Design a protein around this ligand. Structure first.
Ligand SMILES: Cc1cc2nc3c(=O)[nH]c(=O)nc-3n(C[C@H](O)[C@H](O)[C@H](O)COP(=O)(O)OP(=O)(O)OC[C@H]3O[C@@H](n4cnc5c(N)ncnc54)[C@H](O)[C@@H]3O)c2cc1C
Ligand SMILES: NC(=O)c1ccc[n+]([C@@H]2O[C@H](COP(=O)([O-])OP(=O)(O)OC[C@H]3O[C@@H](n4cnc5c(N)ncnc54)[C@H](O)[C@@H]3O)[C@@H](O)[C@H]2O)c1
Ligand SMILES: O=C(O)C1SCCS1
Ligand SMILES: [Mg+2]
Length: 1216
């Protein structure tokens, strides 16, 4: 048996002094990066004056030949609105997908111009891109109804001539402007004109981010065939005067990442070597493009091996991009220059600013990392660029600098920095096709500056173009971009030639972070501190984590019954690693049923003393526990990895979630709890195995901070991390009498629930076990004669709907994560993928290819993607489902498992293609994705089928179309919605988490209504109000007044005002996402009245919160509701057989204690979902206007929208 963590994440090679200096700068504070860059970029007064004069001359030329674009001229000629221009270009795009030119012209003449364009996949799938072209602004989703109206209007107004102009315009841009050519031969033919003027070329076969092995093979043969064509055309011109190629490493392997470094060096490197050998034989340049920040240092390992490989000697064409917007850039250049000296290869170094800025900001915020790997002020990147250019110009004997820029100020500064001596091969400039030719026609040639420029030339069909094209249009439209400002009349030439080096030097704090971009720690501002993660791409982090993880594995972890009086004796057994039962993780002593009953009595005796600790001090304990967990995160990771079968990434997220619960409930307490919000009493917290620290901590922390002593009963599978969490909470100041730990199985849970002094239960787990607890509690009443509160958060049958406008690569990534992360052992995991029929085959092929790149095994290796299932019984239950489906004829795709999995309990990720959604009965808690197909016109029926399971936890939708978003999100019934992203997000206070139906009672964990359920009188949560009044409530109040029920009419009006139905908030979070929180009606509420006035109060509460009702017909109160307004009657039904008329979404009960007990038992016997029941006596209804609390009669819905899904971030376009 291998030692734990002995092979966790060894580096590709020992890290040299130069490599370690790169890693040290990864997230260096911006105020530390800039001073040395300012010093390096400083030039003399004479040079700065000459550079400004050169830059002014270049800018005056650019503005003096500036002409209006063809799109702007078309919009002007036909007086088009912006939406009309966008819709016209979408139509033109679709028309050009008809190959036969004469067939297209006939369709235009006889069908399109004749009105009905709809008759002949949305036309507007790519409207976000055309929106950038027409308006310069990026919209994340498409208003397809606005575009359809605009297209009808413009065709009916202008007819065939405008369509003809649109087609011809789109044909030029897509064939000549967006790309240099559709094929490499076409691009080579079009390059002759500018090569005669002194330009050179580097061709990019458009392609990146391979999803499957087949994709990577395709990109490889594209590169290989382009090298042949370029080399044949080069015909011996060499690497400086002749053309070259650019490649992206992510195109050549589907798992290009630090986590898969061994596969990268074993599988990707030989492919790059084979391409480089061919480039060497033709003597052309081969450049490795730079991608995301977490790929930089990995790419250096490939560069090093290739430059030391003797088979490539004699050739100086290997090239490499370095991004000046990155904090590591000068240290990367130090490494490359030294490698060039060691190898004797004159490495071609392309200095760029960088293409992924928006995405790097979002990623660092999501991951809770210390800082960004890029600058946050645009002028900092400019200073970085000039400083790095000085370093390169001092090293032209050993490297070939290539200065890629469209900024005339940058260009002029480098041109003068380089001085008077020049020869071809010393250095060059570079620009992008369709962006830089105007500027460099003022540079190339003996009549200008006599400096060469290489054009980066994209090659590809309309299809393969999207990702690259959006990045260019974002660059072109960003407020901070030179190419945008040059065309801004409000921007003077003096502003354009301002020297960024001197502007930065003169700022009061050199290198200060952008004022409007929050560090990841500060996402929530003054409310609370964000939890911090760990960068698993940082070699220093991986080295220290390896040591900490190994040390965690040497510890003698235990879990004991920790009563208020001290540890208790009991039956003891080992806890085994689910991925390898030979790995003993620790020992657990389980609680006897007698000691569990004893613990509740000790909790009851201690309850007054803990309630007396003021809320601010209880919240301070939670904050101290969060600090302790943050500091102990590496050790906690090691325990979670080995006890619960989690990967390192998933364990980090788990510990972050626990920290966030602690800080969120602390802050909510400080905002709400006062002397009149008395605790319930001892609360039993029963938790699941699959989030063994986060959900465990969240329930206990909420109960404790609300003033309740807690009996903590963790899942029998994962007691060790629970015991450590209790240890941390007690260290933080929670008294032993206020938090007792009771390990064991469901018997211990049931004994606690049944104990007489148990005042409340918090349950997270399976729906079937929640139903047993509901039945136990139906026997019971509080000393005040009211039901024992139960929060029961249960399973899901979670769907994702994908239409023909979604991007397959995005979909497949979010499906692989949502369905198979943690081996599908997330309550939020994707269970049913619904694919529109027209794209289903392509997406399924891509999904299956991505499935086969996953690594399944014991999770103490960074390279492992999917770990084990928790037990042999879980495995048996999952496989029985797979075999039942397999026996019914359903197609089943499974990864093959390595033999080393035999010592643990593993289930391979599985795809099952279903015929109907009713083929599924219950939640299958494992790595099993079901796939169904649907026709577009059946979308509404499909949402019905998803709702018809009775679950309502997480739900995903992938679409670009606003009409479809509005339709689906208005009809789906689930607690957590996700648009154009994965569905496993539960960020505390950002996506408050929890569902409806068979998925939960609410209120949501990590949301503002949670603490109020754990006290006898609920406070008013922050931001909890609504100015909207339910109109049926208003009609009912008028009816009450007409009947003479004046006091009840006033109570009804008061309920209408007090209701928070219609609350609609946006919660603070990371950039590039919109996180929304709304209060809706729950549904149909069962009313069990005893008196006429009680019925009127119950009806008012239910209607004020937007619900319909079913009224118990055995009440005999039918005569009390005569002559209702039709609007109210529509919401009212009478029920003789409650079980026939469900499912209900809650219940209101009136009666004395024994009537409430009898009704509670009858309600618990109803089939289906657990009901949140509220009960009151007739006297309580008369005395207390809040006898029925309106908090529990609305339904919380969280929605998370990825607003960067279209390829960039519109808001950050105006941030520089
Ligand atoms: C031929 C060529 C090849 C290229 N290859 C690559 C490549 O392989 N990998 C890659 O990542 N990029 C690459 N780029 C760069 C990228 O695609 C953009 O073209 C370039 O960053 C624009 O810089 P500029 O000097 O033209 O314009 P400018 O307007 O001077 O600079 C714009 C740049 O500033 C940066 N920026 C904007 N806002 C901020 C901010 N708030 N804080 C900090 N920085 C900010 C961004 O990098 C942005 O692109 C290449 C560029 C060219 C011309
Ligand atoms: N809605 C959410 O937020 C959420 C979150 C995570 C997991 N879950 C659900 O939890 C399930 C997986 O977790 P699990 O396997 O640990 O659930 P489980 O129902 O098997 O057990 C959960 C806890 O209940 C206890 N238990 C079992 N029988 C009991 C009984 N008769 N009386 C009292 N307690 C009893 C168990 O010991 C355990 O501590 C999944 O269905 C998952 O969907 C829901
Ligand atoms: O494709 C991109 O976004 C960059 S890589 C080389 C050109 S700019
Ligand atoms: Mg169980």
């Amino acid at each position: 048996a291998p030692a734990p963590f002995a092979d966790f994440a060894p580096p590709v090679r020992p890290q040299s002094t130069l490599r370690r200096a790169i890693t040290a700068a990864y997230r260096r504070p911006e105020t530390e990066c800039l001073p040395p860059l300012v010093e390096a970029a400083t030039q003399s007064k004479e040079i700065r004056d000459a550079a400004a004069s050169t830059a002014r001359k270049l800018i005056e030329a650019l503005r003096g030949k500036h002409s209006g674009s063809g799109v702007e001229g078309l919009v002007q000629e036909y007086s088009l609105s912006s939406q009309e221009g966008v819709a016209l270009m979408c139509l033109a795009e679709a028309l050009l997908r008809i190959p036969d030119t004469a067939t297209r012209d006939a369709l235009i003449r006889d069908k399109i111009a004749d009105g009905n364009w709809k008759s002949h996949r949305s036309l507007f799938v790519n409207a976000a891109t055309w929106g950038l072209v027409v308006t310069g602004k990026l919209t994340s989703t498409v208003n397809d109804r606005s575009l359809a109206a605009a297209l009808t209007r413009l065709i009916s107004r202008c007819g065939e001539p405008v369509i003809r102009r649109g087609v011809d315009m789109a044909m030029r841009m897509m064939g000549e402007q967006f790309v240099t050519g559709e094929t490499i031969r076409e691009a080579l033919k079009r390059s002759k004109e500018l090569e005669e003027k002194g330009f050179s070329y580097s061709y990019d076969m458009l392609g990146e981010a391979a999803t499957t092995a087949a994709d990577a093979e395709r990109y490889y043969r594209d590169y290989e065939s382009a090298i042949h064509a370029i080399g044949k055309a080069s015909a011996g011109r060499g690497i400086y005067e002749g053309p070259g190629i650019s490649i992206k490493l992510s195109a050549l392997h589907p798992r290009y990442s630090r986590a898969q470094a061994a596969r990268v060096m074993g599988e990707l490197l030989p492919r790059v070597k084979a391409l480089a050998l061919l480039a060497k034989n033709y003597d052309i340049g081969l450049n490795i493009d730079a991608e995301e920040a977490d790929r930089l240092e990995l790419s250096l390992d490939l560069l090093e091996v290739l430059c030391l490989d003797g088979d490539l000697s004699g050739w100086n064409g290997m090239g490499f991009v370095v991004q000046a917007y990155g904090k590591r850039c000068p240290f990367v250049l130090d490494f490359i220059i030294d490698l060039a000296r060691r190898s004797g290869r004159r490495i071609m170094v392309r200095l760029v600013k960088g293409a992924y800025w928006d995405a790097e900001i979002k990623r660092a915020q999501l991951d809770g990392l210390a800082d960004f790997p890029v600058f946050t002020r645009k002028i900092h990147t400019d200073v970085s660029y000039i400083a790095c250019a000085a370093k390169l110009l001092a090293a032209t004997d050993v490297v070939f600098p290539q200065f890629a820029t469209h900024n005339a100020q940058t260009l002029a500064a480098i041109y003068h920095m380089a001085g008077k001596d020049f020869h071809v091969g010393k250095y060059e400039f570079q620009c992008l096709h369709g962006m830089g030719e105007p500027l460099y026609e003022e540079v190339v040639g003996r009549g200008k500056l006599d400096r060469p420029c290489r054009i980066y030339a994209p090659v590809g069909t309309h299809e393969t173009l999207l990702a690259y094209l959006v990045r260019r249009l974002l660059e072109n439209g960003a407020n901070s971009s030179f190419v945008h400002r040059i065309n801004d009349p409000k921007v003077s030439i003096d502003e354009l030639i301002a020297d960024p080096v001197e502007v930065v030097r003169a700022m009061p704090v050199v290198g200060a972070k952008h004022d409007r971009i929050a560090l990841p720690a500060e996402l929530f501002g003054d409310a609370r501190t964000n939890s911090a993660g760990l960068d698993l791409s940082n070699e220093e982090t991986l080295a220290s984590l390896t040591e900490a993880l190994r040390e965690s594995a040497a510890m003698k972890w235990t879990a004991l019954p920790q009563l208020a009086t001290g540890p208790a004796a009991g039956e003891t057994r080992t806890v085994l690693n689910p991925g390898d039962h030979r790995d003993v993780v620790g020992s657990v002593t389980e609680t006897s049923e007698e000691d569990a009953r004893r613990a509740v009595r000790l909790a009851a005796d201690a309850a007054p003393d803990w309630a007396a600790v003021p809320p601010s001090e209880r919240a301070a304990c939670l904050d101290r526990a969060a600090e302790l967990m943050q500091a102990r995160m590496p050790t906690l990771l090691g325990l979670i990895i080995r006890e619960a079968g989690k990967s390192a990434l998933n364990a980090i997220a788990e510990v972050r979630e626990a920290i966030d619960f602690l800080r969120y409930y602390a802050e909510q307490t400080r905002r709400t709890l006062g002397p009149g919000h008395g605790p319930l009493g001892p609360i039993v917290c029963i938790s699941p195995w699959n989030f063994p620290l986060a959900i465990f901590t969240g329930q206990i922390a909420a109960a404790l901070v609300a003033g309740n002593p807690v009996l903590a009963k963790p899942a029998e599978e994962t007691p060790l991390i629970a015991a450590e969490g209790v240890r941390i909470l007690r260290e933080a100041g929670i008294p032993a009498s206020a938090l007792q730990l009771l390990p064991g199985d469901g018997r211990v849970g049931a004994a606690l629930v049944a104990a007489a002094e148990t005042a409340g239960v918090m349950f997270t787990g399976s729906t079937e076990v929640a139903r047993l607890i509901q039945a136990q509690l139906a026997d019971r009443l509080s000393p005040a004669g009211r039901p024992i509160p139960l929060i029961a958060e249960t399973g899901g049958q979670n769907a994702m709907i994908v239409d023909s406008s979604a991007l397959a690569e995005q979909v497949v990534g979010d499906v692989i994560t949502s369905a198979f992360d943690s081996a599908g052992q997330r309550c939020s995991a994707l269970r049913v993928l619904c694919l529109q029929e027209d794209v289903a085959d392509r997406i399924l092929t891509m999904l299956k290819g991505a499935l086969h790149e996953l690594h399944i095994g014991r999770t103490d290796r960074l390279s492992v993607d999917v770990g084990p299932v928790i037990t042999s019984e879980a495995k048996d239950n999952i496989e029985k489902h797979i075999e039942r489906m397999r026996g019914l004829g359903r197609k089943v795709e499974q990864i093959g498992l390595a033999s080393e999995t035999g010592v643990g309990t593993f289930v391979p990720p599985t795809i099952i293609e279903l015929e109907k959604l009713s083929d599924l009965q219950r939640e299958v808690f494992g790595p099993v994705l079901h796939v169904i197909r649907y026709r577009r016109d059946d979308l509404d029926r499909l949402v019905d089928d998803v709702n018809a399971t009775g679950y309502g936890l997480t739900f995903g939708l992938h679409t670009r179309l606003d009409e479809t978003i509005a339709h689906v999100t208005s009809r789906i019934k689930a607690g957590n919605l996700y648009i154009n992203r994965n569905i496993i997000g539960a960020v505390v206070g950002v996506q408050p988490f929890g569902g409806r139906g068979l998925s939960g009672t609410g209120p949501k964990a990590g949301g503002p209504l949670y603490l109020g359920r754990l006290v006898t009188t609920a406070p008013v949560p922050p931001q909890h109000s609504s100015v909207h009044t339910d109109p049926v409530l208003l009609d009912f109040a008028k009816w009450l007044d007409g009947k003479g029920a004046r006091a009840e009419a006033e109570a009804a009006r008061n309920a209408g005002s007090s209701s928070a139905l219609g609350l609609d908030l946006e919660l603070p979070g990371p950039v590039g996402e919109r996180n929304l929180y709304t209060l809706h009606a729950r549904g149909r509420i069962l009313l069990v009245p005893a008196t006429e006035s009680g019925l009127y109060h119950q009806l008012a509460a239910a209607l004020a919160t937007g619900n319909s009702v079913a009224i118990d017909a055995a009440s005999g109160l039918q005569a009390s509701l005569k002559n209702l307004p039709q609007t109210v009657g529509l919401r009212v039904s009478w029920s003789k057989d409650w079980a026939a008329d469900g499912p209900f979404a809650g219940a209101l009960v009136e009666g004395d204690a024994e009537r409430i007990r009898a009704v509670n038992k009858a309600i618990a016997a109803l089939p289906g979902p657990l009901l949140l029941v509220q009960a009151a006596s007739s006297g309580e209804i008369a005395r207390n206007p809040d006898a029925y609390c309106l908090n529990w009669l609305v339904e919380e819905v969280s929605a998370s929208i990825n607003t960067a899904a279209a390829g960039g971030n519109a808001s950050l376009m105006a941030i520089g």
